[PDB]
Amino acid sequence: VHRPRRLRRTAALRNLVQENTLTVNDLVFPLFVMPGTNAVEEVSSMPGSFRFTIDRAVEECKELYDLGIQGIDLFGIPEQKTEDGSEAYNDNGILQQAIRAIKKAVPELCIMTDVALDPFTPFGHDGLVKDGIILNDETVEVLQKMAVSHAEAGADFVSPSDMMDGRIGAIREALDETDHSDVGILSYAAKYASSFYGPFRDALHSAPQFGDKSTYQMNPANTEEAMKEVELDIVEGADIVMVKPGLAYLDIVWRTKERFDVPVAIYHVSGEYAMVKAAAAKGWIDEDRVMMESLLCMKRAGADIIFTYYAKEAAKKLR
Amino acid sequence: VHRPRRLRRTAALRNLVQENTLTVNDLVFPLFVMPGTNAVEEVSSMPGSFRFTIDRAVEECKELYDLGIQGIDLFGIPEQKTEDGSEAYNDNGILQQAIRAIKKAVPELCIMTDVALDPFTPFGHDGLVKDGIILNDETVEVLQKMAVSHAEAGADFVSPSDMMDGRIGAIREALDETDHSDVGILSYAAKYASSFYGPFRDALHSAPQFGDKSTYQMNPANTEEAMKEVELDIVEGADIVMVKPGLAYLDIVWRTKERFDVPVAIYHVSGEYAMVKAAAAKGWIDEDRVMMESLLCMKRAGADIIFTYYAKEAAKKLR
Amino acid sequence: VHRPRRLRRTAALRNLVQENTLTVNDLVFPLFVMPGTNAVEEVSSMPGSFRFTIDRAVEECKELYDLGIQGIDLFGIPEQKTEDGSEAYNDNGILQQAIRAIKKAVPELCIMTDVALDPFTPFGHDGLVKDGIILNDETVEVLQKMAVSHAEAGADFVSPSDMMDGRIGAIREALDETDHSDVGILSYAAKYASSFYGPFRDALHSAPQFGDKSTYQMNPANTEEAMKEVELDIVEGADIVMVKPGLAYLDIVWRTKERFDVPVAIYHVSGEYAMVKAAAAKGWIDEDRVMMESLLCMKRAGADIIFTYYAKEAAKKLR
Amino acid sequence: VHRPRRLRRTAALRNLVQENTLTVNDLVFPLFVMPGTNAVEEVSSMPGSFRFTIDRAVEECKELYDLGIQGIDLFGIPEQKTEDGSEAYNDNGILQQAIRAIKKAVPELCIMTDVALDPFTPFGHDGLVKDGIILNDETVEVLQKMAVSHAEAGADFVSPSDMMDGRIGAIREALDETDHSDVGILSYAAKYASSFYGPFRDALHSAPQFGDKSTYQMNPANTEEAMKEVELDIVEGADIVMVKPGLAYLDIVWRTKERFDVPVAIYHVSGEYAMVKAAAAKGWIDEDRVMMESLLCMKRAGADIIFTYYAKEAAKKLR
Amino acid sequence: VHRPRRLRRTAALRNLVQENTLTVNDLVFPLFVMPGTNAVEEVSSMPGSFRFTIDRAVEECKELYDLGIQGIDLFGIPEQKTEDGSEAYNDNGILQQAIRAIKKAVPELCIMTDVALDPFTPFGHDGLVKDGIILNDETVEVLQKMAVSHAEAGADFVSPSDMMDGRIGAIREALDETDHSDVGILSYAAKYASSFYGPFRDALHSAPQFGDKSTYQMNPANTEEAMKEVELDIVEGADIVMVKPGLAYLDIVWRTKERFDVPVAIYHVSGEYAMVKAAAAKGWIDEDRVMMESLLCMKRAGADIIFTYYAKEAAKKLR
Amino acid sequence: VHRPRRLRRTAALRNLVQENTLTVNDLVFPLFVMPGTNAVEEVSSMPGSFRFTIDRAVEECKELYDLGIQGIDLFGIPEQKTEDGSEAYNDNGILQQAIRAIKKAVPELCIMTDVALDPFTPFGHDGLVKDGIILNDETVEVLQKMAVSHAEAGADFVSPSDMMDGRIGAIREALDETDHSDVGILSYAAKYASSFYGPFRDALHSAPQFGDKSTYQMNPANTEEAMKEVELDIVEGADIVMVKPGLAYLDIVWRTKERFDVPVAIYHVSGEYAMVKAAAAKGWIDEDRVMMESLLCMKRAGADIIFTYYAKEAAKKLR
Ligand SMILES: [Mg+2]
Ligand SMILES: [Mg+2]
Ligand SMILES: [Mg+2]
Ligand SMILES: [Mg+2]
Ligand SMILES: [Mg+2]
Ligand SMILES: [Mg+2]
């Protein structure tokens, strides 16, 4: 009676019944900005990735928007790192600047700024360290200061990736109090402590990791906890919720989709990306086929948005 | 705390989180075929809709596929009508000849053929009429022959729209018995007796409708019964299932998609088509906007394939 | 074993098993009031629709109630439009007046008043515009002022159709503070930005649309968002929740029914209405069959109340 | 109030509430067998992965079981290839001889045998090719013989990876017909057409792939179809069901486990394996960490058995 | 078609498909401390159980941690009992002391302290008694005082087993106010009034029971109530929720697992433990087989943590 | 706001809302029958449990029914054991003779007979042993004969406890084939391989257990498999389904009752019985309290019928 192959006999039928499709509007492009003028830097562990100066960031975004890309995620590489990470909320920082410069040249691009104290502190953690402890409530306080500054600079969205407890609520409360109740918040709800963040550390020249971040980042073994985390975030006001990493966490994505009916974002981390790059370089796989497909999978798992370093290459492929 | 508008502030943002999009691969074009050579007649009640001769129809398909449209729904309009409606399964019928020519000229186009005795009988009914009674099992025996015949000519798919009991099963058996287990079946699982069918009858030269098809077509007040019908056909072997009509039956489509894990199809019926045509002709509505939008709504509801007379105008727009 | 047609063999059985029925109590009649005396105006894009003077509004309602209709929805057409739309909360406005006049003559009719700043502002939006921005929190403030005035005038219900964030809560808070905790609130929970609102603009002589309302009105592609919207509204205190438009959004209606167990309303917008009018005028469909049936569909989708310009014609048909 | 971090403050706490752990009893080791005596060849695209002769393979198994690994997946690589692929069911085939020797040397090791015509045919396909068509029912008839043959040699389990329609059923019948109702069946229920299979083909000396297996292998965009496929096989008699590939299809695995109450299996495909190999060789990722972690993710998703080329390196690590 | 035994034919397969496993990290070891130096006491009704002096408690924990055990549960046996049970929050009590001494010697062990006024009051109840009434809100007040002291002493977690209403919220509020918002709370959510607590009374030399505790402890007949209880606790801030007793309450454990997605703990009470001890002493059962298995059952029911007096013997068995 | 204790303040209140109660109609009494006349032997490992001769057994039943107990589970203990275990279906077997005498003396007592080859074979197994293999289909053929034989003697019910594949089906067919469609079937759907069975073996003079029954009895770590097993038997025709053992498998019982809408039965196994016996004999536990309570827990979990050796002591207590 049943012969599933009937729906595969031809590309037409296959084309007709396909449950999911990937589109440019599903892509968000991370951007690493640095101090200086007229300069871009190839990232060693991330072939194809780059550190941009602001003036070069603007140049890129201009190409981005023209290719279809709808938003990016700004990472700020400060010249100096401190223990109190106060540079985060300096309105004259590279990040704030880039925010300003970009919003002006390509105003129709959704700028999303990264919120975390890793690139600004000398211990490799996303929060303030005291006596070996990543201080929770104290870190949010800076995170708040930080976020408000991004808004002041013209940030469209903020994306706290800190995994500190109850930071989405505090941050949202601050944005409201400074007339920024319209700036969205994309929160890293289910960010796990993963061995996939390798190539990224070197990308922004972040201080030595110095002890895992497993005191706030999630245990990769855990699922139920992801539901606990997301829910708390939505209740706090998160406009969108994200899972990180992505490729090997598609079950966490599907689950968030089925339960919360809020937009769901996912991160194609440096490792999954750098991994396909290295295998292709040896001729063991197809860069194009593998990259795109793995994006399809993220779409089939329920993701709506996808932070991917392949974002620009995928937009040309869909052009 | 919450502010849904935050996801609407900007085209970018709006483009990123949009839950559904419409694509060319969602569209199936109804093609009306008539006897004769090199000719075309617009349908009075369906502006921009025409009947084609085989020659003209083959060329049209060429333009169809070129635009990306993946499939067509072949509708036959025999020269003579009979009470036993035997022409339906004639190897030289105008329909059959269309199947043969099309598959040859445009092999890559998935050809779905309509299966029903409506255009082949004088009573304007989808089945055989005895004494004011539209016979079920008798009618099905003529449908089988029809389906095989269509398969014998090169059909890729048949779409029984009769609403006879146990017709999907019988047909699936006949098709397999004649070495056509590769030929799928698209079942009008839930076809209601609607007043949304007006303009269509003239399209094919209908016949003394005589009474009404409410003894086999479903009452538009019922939803549960639609779940019974579909489950019955899926159990029978239907590869795909369709709801008819479409615009005003999106709740049935959402229910279908939500429960049966099989491809779901909807029908942008003639009455829906003409209605935009008319309103637009008065300047009360924007034809292109309402048409495309109404297609979107069908995607939002859970439809994978859309049988629409606007198929060609959408493929361009989607181009 | 199974033969679904057994339940369709006769009108008796069909009559017995029918899942849903439409009744007069499912209908609500919109009423467009204007300044002046003894005068009614045919609406160009809405054949059968009219602008009534108060004295003629009262005359109509008297006929309405006698035909069975249980409530109407008052729209107020001011003589002058301002940027601050302060006329909305003028207790001497046409709307308030009509409220008073009607409540007196036909006190047993549930008056529902429209809350929005579109007919009162010169930019064609339902809220206050500043620098191209439809101001959210500022608009509610007027909406509150407005609502309280409707209550003071004797309004039974208020129906904010503004789609501003968190207006149901604010409005409800105001009604309570002014001894109007008994006045209900029918909120347009899931109001989409649609191409179906065509003929309505001209109806009330509303200022040129001047840019879509997609910054607050919902993306027609979205469903999950509709659940997010409704829930927020119910939590805020909405007595009833409505979806708009209706005909092509029946999946949004069914979904709200199954999830929230609060009364569910729907809108038969000008487009769906004007659409059946134009098609019938060409003889392409049956005005009666199409109008009523599409109302049946709304009932089968789960709607309890139905704002329809056919309300009066449907009540005669059910008389 | 809430503070998820409270469960992360300490290794103890973290160890207590961890939802999932990975064990040696989750692992199944793919073994590639080739003709000849005392020899071994590493796979170019799969570092640390080798082909074995029967003698070398028996010894390897000894080391396997000693490490706790409970099962193996025997892969055959015949000397000569044919179009009817008859060698597949030859009692003296290199595969069969491996089954016989292994069960004798290490009886306590559960031997699962691969069932597909890929290594036995020149077209590099899993079924019989007629005229560019991969035959289903014909191919299945050769699979049955294959399965019985394997059972006749002492196989404990067969794992049809062909993706032919109704193959589990046919095989289960053949096996029972020859007194092998004790021989289970591990079905590749949902095997997609992925670009994650690159390195594997060379492992066995693949053949003119010619076209693509997207007429029987599933489209990576679909999830619903995966539920259809599995349910079909469980209904057929499959003792266990597998998803392929693995890392990027964890949503399919969670869905499977969540709905079918039968043992679920996943595949750490070659492309996934090599990808860590490559990245690690560059020093971008920690090979041991990513490998083990990715295995964990598969446990978190709902996988019970893992076919992984890292099986031996995990058993040690888990030791 | 189906033969479940296929998955049991061998230990390998059995080993592969096993749904659940018990691990050291699933075990928590209760510890009874008493005043004095260099001394341990065999518990009469709990063969293998002991009362430890602090210096001997430290000695045990040192062995515990080395065997794998990740946390213990401290019970404090005061020399004097009062009616106001003020000794509970004496920072110089045996309990506080033991807390201090243990944290120092084996700092990497998760200390969990018991919160209740039974060992500190002369009426055998877990709260303050007035006129035959176990005072609810007054008892929490002490419970708060108590908890804060445990935190001050260095307690990792507190485990209120009092079954007083709304004590998890109050206690959590106190810990926060005294800079202990990082100390977790394992609450006895569903603690029933059971005949299984026999041997435990004598263990800590608790005052005569003097009337059941059925005025706060749960009716063993009740299930729905357990859902009511847990939910209230989670909403109050409980990090983990526990059911007590365990062996004959596995349905209450499974239910809490499926509903709340918070970590779930269970208690192997003195009775279930002392029961297996007595039956084995007569040669009527296997101490080892019965003890371990019943722990497996608790794991299969959904428990994550298990307070068991066999904890040390089970850790050797898993070593 | 909330205070669950409000429902515990008083015996009245507690008695009113109690979710479950235990009744005499929940109890089924296992009866062990042996050859000979007028004699009785207490079981060493089951104090208060005895074996009866037919005469003594008939009288016991008289006392049973008088106390309200509605049913019994007849256990046979043949004089001689054989490898083909043919005595099982001997019309003059000690079991059969018991059936005949009982039904005559106490017709109103529902007689359920045990169906398994354990007491009838020397290998102490429930099926036929060939070469260290417990044969399934062969064993079932002997079970059928057994069941019919029992029905032929006047049995009201048979309770296959063998855990053979497809035995319920075969037996149900045999029973119907011999005009016994009125004879129900109580299936040990989910009987685990537990160490809770110690005392029972001696009760019947077990035999060289030789190995273990883990090739047909279920692994105590699994729950999903229990759902597979039950559904399989219900599909086969089992009137009722049982879980074994009981106390420590209440999660399986709740799951059963929750999903299958068929009567559910549990088994207070020997190891559970003796365990209270022993602890009570030491004065560590109150035997009457723990016994009755543990029965309650079984009612709370969803059990309708309880096979317990405490049946008679409960009927009195419940009297
Ligand atoms: Mg969080
Ligand atoms: Mg039907
Ligand atoms: Mg809203
Ligand atoms: Mg399949
Ligand atoms: Mg409580
Ligand atoms: Mg079974």
Side-chain angles (χ1 to χ4, degrees), chain E residues 70-86:
Chain E
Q70 291 296 88
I72 84 280
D73 188 31
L74 277 167
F75 287 81
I77 297 194
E79 43 274 275
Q80 215 61 265
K81 311 194 126 76
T82 70
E83 222 167 359
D84 70 351
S86 47

PDB file of all heavy atoms in Angstrom, chain E residues 70-86:
ATOM      1  N   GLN E  70      29.497  11.913  45.929  1.00  0.00           N
ATOM      2  CA  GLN E  70      29.606  13.309  45.528  1.00  0.00           C
ATOM      3  C   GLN E  70      29.007  14.258  46.557  1.00  0.00           C
ATOM      4  O   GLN E  70      29.297  15.456  46.551  1.00  0.00           O
ATOM      5  CB  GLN E  70      28.922  13.517  44.173  1.00  0.00           C
ATOM      6  CG  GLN E  70      29.646  12.868  43.004  1.00  0.00           C
ATOM      7  CD  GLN E  70      31.014  13.471  42.760  1.00  0.00           C
ATOM      8  OE1 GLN E  70      32.009  13.032  43.340  1.00  0.00           O
ATOM      9  NE2 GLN E  70      31.075  14.481  41.900  1.00  0.00           N
ATOM     10  N   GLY E  71      28.166  13.738  47.446  1.00  0.00           N
ATOM     11  CA  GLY E  71      27.564  14.564  48.481  1.00  0.00           C
ATOM     12  C   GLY E  71      26.940  13.745  49.592  1.00  0.00           C
ATOM     13  O   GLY E  71      26.594  12.578  49.400  1.00  0.00           O
ATOM     14  N   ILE E  72      26.790  14.350  50.768  1.00  0.00           N
ATOM     15  CA  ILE E  72      26.145  13.677  51.889  1.00  0.00           C
ATOM     16  C   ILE E  72      25.048  14.549  52.492  1.00  0.00           C
ATOM     17  O   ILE E  72      24.881  15.705  52.103  1.00  0.00           O
ATOM     18  CB  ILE E  72      27.154  13.303  52.991  1.00  0.00           C
ATOM     19  CG1 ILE E  72      27.457  14.441  53.968  1.00  0.00           C
ATOM     20  CG2 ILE E  72      28.436  12.761  52.381  1.00  0.00           C
ATOM     21  CD1 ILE E  72      28.448  15.456  53.442  1.00  0.00           C
ATOM     22  N   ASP E  73      24.308  13.986  53.439  1.00  0.00           N
ATOM     23  CA  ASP E  73      23.233  14.707  54.113  1.00  0.00           C
ATOM     24  C   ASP E  73      23.416  14.658  55.627  1.00  0.00           C
ATOM     25  O   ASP E  73      23.252  13.606  56.246  1.00  0.00           O
ATOM     26  CB  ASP E  73      21.876  14.126  53.718  1.00  0.00           C
ATOM     27  CG  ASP E  73      20.706  14.940  54.230  1.00  0.00           C
ATOM     28  OD1 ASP E  73      20.846  16.173  54.362  1.00  0.00           O
ATOM     29  OD2 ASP E  73      19.643  14.342  54.503  1.00  0.00           O
ATOM     30  N   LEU E  74      23.760  15.796  56.218  1.00  0.00           N
ATOM     31  CA  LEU E  74      24.140  15.858  57.623  1.00  0.00           C
ATOM     32  C   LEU E  74      22.925  15.918  58.543  1.00  0.00           C
ATOM     33  O   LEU E  74      22.082  16.808  58.423  1.00  0.00           O
ATOM     34  CB  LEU E  74      25.033  17.075  57.878  1.00  0.00           C
ATOM     35  CG  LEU E  74      26.522  16.911  57.573  1.00  0.00           C
ATOM     36  CD1 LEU E  74      27.220  18.264  57.571  1.00  0.00           C
ATOM     37  CD2 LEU E  74      27.178  15.970  58.572  1.00  0.00           C
ATOM     38  N   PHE E  75      22.845  14.969  59.468  1.00  0.00           N
ATOM     39  CA  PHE E  75      21.867  15.025  60.549  1.00  0.00           C
ATOM     40  C   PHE E  75      22.558  15.301  61.881  1.00  0.00           C
ATOM     41  O   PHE E  75      23.587  14.698  62.187  1.00  0.00           O
ATOM     42  CB  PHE E  75      21.068  13.724  60.630  1.00  0.00           C
ATOM     43  CG  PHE E  75      20.060  13.534  59.528  1.00  0.00           C
ATOM     44  CD1 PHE E  75      20.449  13.068  58.282  1.00  0.00           C
ATOM     45  CD2 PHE E  75      18.720  13.821  59.731  1.00  0.00           C
ATOM     46  CE1 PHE E  75      19.530  12.889  57.267  1.00  0.00           C
ATOM     47  CE2 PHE E  75      17.794  13.646  58.722  1.00  0.00           C
ATOM     48  CZ  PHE E  75      18.196  13.179  57.486  1.00  0.00           C
ATOM     49  N   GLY E  76      21.996  16.214  62.666  1.00  0.00           N
ATOM     50  CA  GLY E  76      22.634  16.675  63.885  1.00  0.00           C
ATOM     51  C   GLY E  76      21.951  16.169  65.138  1.00  0.00           C
ATOM     52  O   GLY E  76      20.773  16.447  65.370  1.00  0.00           O
ATOM     53  N   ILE E  77      22.687  15.423  65.956  1.00  0.00           N
ATOM     54  CA  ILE E  77      22.145  14.890  67.200  1.00  0.00           C
ATOM     55  C   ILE E  77      22.608  15.715  68.395  1.00  0.00           C
ATOM     56  O   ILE E  77      23.724  15.542  68.884  1.00  0.00           O
ATOM     57  CB  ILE E  77      22.550  13.419  67.411  1.00  0.00           C
ATOM     58  CG1 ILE E  77      22.014  12.463  66.344  1.00  0.00           C
ATOM     59  CG2 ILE E  77      22.154  12.950  68.802  1.00  0.00           C
ATOM     60  CD1 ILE E  77      22.136  11.001  66.725  1.00  0.00           C
ATOM     61  N   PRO E  78      21.748  16.614  68.860  1.00  0.00           N
ATOM     62  CA  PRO E  78      22.090  17.481  69.989  1.00  0.00           C
ATOM     63  C   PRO E  78      22.078  16.719  71.309  1.00  0.00           C
ATOM     64  O   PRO E  78      21.367  15.723  71.455  1.00  0.00           O
ATOM     65  CB  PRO E  78      20.970  18.523  69.977  1.00  0.00           C
ATOM     66  CG  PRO E  78      19.808  17.802  69.377  1.00  0.00           C
ATOM     67  CD  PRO E  78      20.392  16.870  68.350  1.00  0.00           C
ATOM     68  N   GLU E  79      22.868  17.194  72.263  1.00  0.00           N
ATOM     69  CA  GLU E  79      22.927  16.591  73.589  1.00  0.00           C
ATOM     70  C   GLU E  79      21.677  16.924  74.395  1.00  0.00           C
ATOM     71  O   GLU E  79      21.205  16.117  75.195  1.00  0.00           O
ATOM     72  CB  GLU E  79      24.178  17.060  74.334  1.00  0.00           C
ATOM     73  CG  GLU E  79      24.465  18.545  74.185  1.00  0.00           C
ATOM     74  CD  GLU E  79      25.265  18.867  72.937  1.00  0.00           C
ATOM     75  OE1 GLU E  79      26.508  18.771  72.985  1.00  0.00           O
ATOM     76  OE2 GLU E  79      24.648  19.215  71.908  1.00  0.00           O
ATOM     77  N   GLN E  80      21.145  18.122  74.171  1.00  0.00           N
ATOM     78  CA  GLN E  80      19.954  18.576  74.875  1.00  0.00           C
ATOM     79  C   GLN E  80      18.828  18.921  73.906  1.00  0.00           C
ATOM     80  O   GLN E  80      19.064  19.478  72.834  1.00  0.00           O
ATOM     81  CB  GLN E  80      20.279  19.791  75.748  1.00  0.00           C
ATOM     82  CG  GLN E  80      19.500  19.837  77.052  1.00  0.00           C
ATOM     83  CD  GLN E  80      19.777  18.636  77.936  1.00  0.00           C
ATOM     84  OE1 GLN E  80      19.039  17.652  77.916  1.00  0.00           O
ATOM     85  NE2 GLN E  80      20.849  18.714  78.716  1.00  0.00           N
ATOM     86  N   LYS E  81      17.602  18.589  74.294  1.00  0.00           N
ATOM     87  CA  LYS E  81      16.425  18.944  73.509  1.00  0.00           C
ATOM     88  C   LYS E  81      15.561  19.959  74.250  1.00  0.00           C
ATOM     89  O   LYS E  81      15.334  19.835  75.455  1.00  0.00           O
ATOM     90  CB  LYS E  81      15.606  17.696  73.175  1.00  0.00           C
ATOM     91  CG  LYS E  81      16.432  16.551  72.605  1.00  0.00           C
ATOM     92  CD  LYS E  81      15.547  15.488  71.976  1.00  0.00           C
ATOM     93  CE  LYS E  81      15.952  15.207  70.539  1.00  0.00           C
ATOM     94  NZ  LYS E  81      17.191  14.384  70.458  1.00  0.00           N
ATOM     95  N   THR E  82      15.084  20.966  73.525  1.00  0.00           N
ATOM     96  CA  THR E  82      14.215  21.981  74.109  1.00  0.00           C
ATOM     97  C   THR E  82      12.877  22.033  73.380  1.00  0.00           C
ATOM     98  O   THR E  82      12.702  21.399  72.338  1.00  0.00           O
ATOM     99  CB  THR E  82      14.862  23.378  74.075  1.00  0.00           C
ATOM    100  OG1 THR E  82      14.918  23.850  72.724  1.00  0.00           O
ATOM    101  CG2 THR E  82      16.295  23.316  74.582  1.00  0.00           C
ATOM    102  N   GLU E  83      11.932  22.789  73.931  1.00  0.00           N
ATOM    103  CA  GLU E  83      10.615  22.903  73.312  1.00  0.00           C
ATOM    104  C   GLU E  83      10.635  23.903  72.162  1.00  0.00           C
ATOM    105  O   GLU E  83       9.875  23.767  71.201  1.00  0.00           O
ATOM    106  CB  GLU E  83       9.565  23.306  74.350  1.00  0.00           C
ATOM    107  CG  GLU E  83       8.253  22.550  74.219  1.00  0.00           C
ATOM    108  CD  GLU E  83       7.349  22.721  75.423  1.00  0.00           C
ATOM    109  OE1 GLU E  83       7.753  23.415  76.379  1.00  0.00           O
ATOM    110  OE2 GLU E  83       6.232  22.162  75.413  1.00  0.00           O
ATOM    111  N   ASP E  84      11.505  24.906  72.259  1.00  0.00           N
ATOM    112  CA  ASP E  84      11.579  25.938  71.227  1.00  0.00           C
ATOM    113  C   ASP E  84      12.633  25.598  70.178  1.00  0.00           C
ATOM    114  O   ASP E  84      12.848  26.361  69.237  1.00  0.00           O
ATOM    115  CB  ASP E  84      11.871  27.302  71.853  1.00  0.00           C
ATOM    116  CG  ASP E  84      13.278  27.422  72.400  1.00  0.00           C
ATOM    117  OD1 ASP E  84      13.990  26.398  72.458  1.00  0.00           O
ATOM    118  OD2 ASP E  84      13.674  28.546  72.776  1.00  0.00           O
ATOM    119  N   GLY E  85      13.274  24.448  70.348  1.00  0.00           N
ATOM    120  CA  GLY E  85      14.234  23.916  69.403  1.00  0.00           C
ATOM    121  C   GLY E  85      15.241  24.942  68.928  1.00  0.00           C
ATOM    122  O   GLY E  85      15.646  24.927  67.763  1.00  0.00           O
ATOM    123  N   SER E  86      15.657  25.837  69.819  1.00  0.00           N
ATOM    124  CA  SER E  86      16.557  26.926  69.454  1.00  0.00           C
ATOM    125  C   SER E  86      17.954  26.416  69.126  1.00  0.00           C
ATOM    126  O   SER E  86      18.739  27.106  68.472  1.00  0.00           O
ATOM    127  CB  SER E  86      16.624  27.958  70.583  1.00  0.00           C
ATOM    128  OG  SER E  86      16.810  27.330  71.840  1.00  0.00           O
TER     129      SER E  86
END
